[PDB]
Amino acid sequence: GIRLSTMSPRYLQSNSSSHTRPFSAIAELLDNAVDPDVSARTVFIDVEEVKNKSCLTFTDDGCGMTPHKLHRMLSFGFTDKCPIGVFGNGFKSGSMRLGKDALVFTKNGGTLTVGLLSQTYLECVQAQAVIVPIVPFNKKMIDSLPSLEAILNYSIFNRENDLLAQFDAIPGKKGTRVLIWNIRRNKNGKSELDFDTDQYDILVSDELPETEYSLRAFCGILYMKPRMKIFLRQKKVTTQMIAKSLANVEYDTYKPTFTNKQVRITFGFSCKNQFGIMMYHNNRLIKSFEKVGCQVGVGVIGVIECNFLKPAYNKQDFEYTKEYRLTINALAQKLNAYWKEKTKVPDQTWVQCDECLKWRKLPGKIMLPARWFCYYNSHYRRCSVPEEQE
Ligand SMILES: Nc1ncnc2c1ncn2[C@@H]1O[C@H](COP(=O)(O)OP(=O)(O)NP(=O)(O)O)[C@@H](O)[C@H]1O
Ligand SMILES: [Mg+2]
Ligand SMILES: [Zn+2]
């Protein structure tokens, strides 16, 4: 009837500017593997060399997607959503922020579907609109025929057997695998992300917290209570409950002016030197190590989850409202009170079971073990007992 609002392929480049830091795009991808619909048990971040080209790999063993839902994924604004995703843009901004081209393999226990979000493909054919090739799969193919030809002719996978074997890189029968190539290179010529300095870490070519340049430490605190396992370059990331790993822990509260829900704030001391305020939102870290009050008070960390706020388009900050300024003022005042109240090893030690993903409180020390199971506890010794009261 009426002509639709088209979208230029340049928009894929434009949208990539949503994230000012690449760890935020990577966080977008991890947030998509952890949301309750998918609820992946494990995600794998790695760098793989394909066709003499560096590729970022994000492989989760989650629910998987249908060919229809994969198109919805590669489309804008489509989301069936305390999940983290709200916009229906996270992947389209994050993957493009990481590289020019992205492939998404997904299997949901019966269908093998491939999707391509590549600006290189769109610029080679000089398309005027955004074209997204998608192919579903016995492994017999199922509309998808020109998509498969475009993928074989313009992506990094030229042979059909290699394209299908990429599904075997999912550690289960259901899961998703994102593969981003043509990564962002900064002005000095090198790649923005560092793969060679630390074989078990992805760094940034940079006082400044180690979370700002170390992807391992960033993933360690990306979530307020981790439930999903993260493997950075085949090595498990020892995540932590940033609130429970503090010493001399005291508590405070904050009431938003537009509701009657008390929000708990946890104040403590860091055990390894760096510090500030951890502002979360639906378990996701939005603002990290924000100095408030007498910190501009060394070593004190305050944890707060602000579900009464709403993050920005990139989930790196919040909307600048009266509630936000009031929350920061309150945090500064209460942190000053906490530090005034005081004039090592954490008060509690918590470990996540490797097979079980629950957090158990141990009477021990804190770094933390790589693999640990409920069966190894000192009494809660079985993986069938739920978490503690917390
Ligand atoms: N790794 C994944 N595994 C399974 N399903 C996924 C995955 N990534 C995306 N999806 C699905 O595809 C949709 C695309 O989401 P996306 O465009 O990234 O934004 P969103 O997750 O909907 N919310 P937002 O991140 O704020 O934009 C998701 O809502 C899921 O339904
Ligand atoms: Mg998303
Ligand atoms: Zn367990």
Coordinates of C-alpha atoms in Angstrom, one line a residue, residues 26 63 68 103 140 164 229 301 321-322 326 351 372:
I26 CA 30.9 -7.6 23.7
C63 CA 18.0 -22.3 23.4
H68 CA 11.9 -16.7 11.6
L103 CA 27.7 -14.5 10.8
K140 CA 19.2 -31.0 4.0
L164 CA 27.8 -26.5 7.8
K229 CA 29.8 -19.5 32.6
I301 CA 33.2 -0.2 46.8
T321 CA 16.8 12.6 35.3
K322 CA 16.0 13.9 38.7
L326 CA 19.3 12.1 43.5
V351 CA 32.1 -20.1 44.9
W372 CA 34.6 -26.3 41.7

